[PDB]
Paper text:
Type [name] collagen is an extracellular matrix protein, which is important for skin stability. The structure of the [name] subdomain of type [name] collagen has been determined, and it has been shown that [name] interacts with integrins.
In addition, a new interaction site for laminin‐332 was identified and characterized. These data provide new insights into [name] functions in the extracellular matrix.
Author numbering: 1052 to 1205, 1208 to 1238
Write the structure that this text describes.
Amino acid sequence: GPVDVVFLLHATRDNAHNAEAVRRVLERLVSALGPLGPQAAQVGLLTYSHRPSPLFPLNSSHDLGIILRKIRDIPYVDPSGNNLGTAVTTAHRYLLASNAPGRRQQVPGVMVLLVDEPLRGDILSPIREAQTSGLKVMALSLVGADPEQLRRLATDPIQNFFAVDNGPGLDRAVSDLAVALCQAA
Ligand SMILES: [Mg+2]
Ligand SMILES: [Mg+2]
């Protein structure tokens, strides 16, 4: 069935060296959603440093080729910063809210969190409010992240996946999340 998915990525000059690995991850996750279309899957994207950067809304395009180029051209230019909290809030207010561009009513909304560093500041309040508004929150913790942080948010439990390494550990986590996304519709 139809689904509105918005991915949240940590993107700075500090983790620019992992951009290609993350791109391949996102490609698999976008594939997991099935055909893109106004009556099918939609994808939005926001990145975060200390500040949030919405890159494109759910209805920016249904052309898979264009969407993947946008992902390819994600700016990794910002200074150091890992403010996931404000990112969640911004993605909610401007990309997944009922009034957001391309957001479809009676369609499940999903917020997918990519994390690769220990989290600073409050994430509990933004995530809880996203859940309360009816959004499904999922998180992929990449190598470098603290795997316990997004597991101890007690708000409803999150579907968490942790890459214990950048190899098979990563592959398993991504596959598990891909299955989880397929079921979210
Ligand atoms: Mg083209
Ligand atoms: Mg950083």
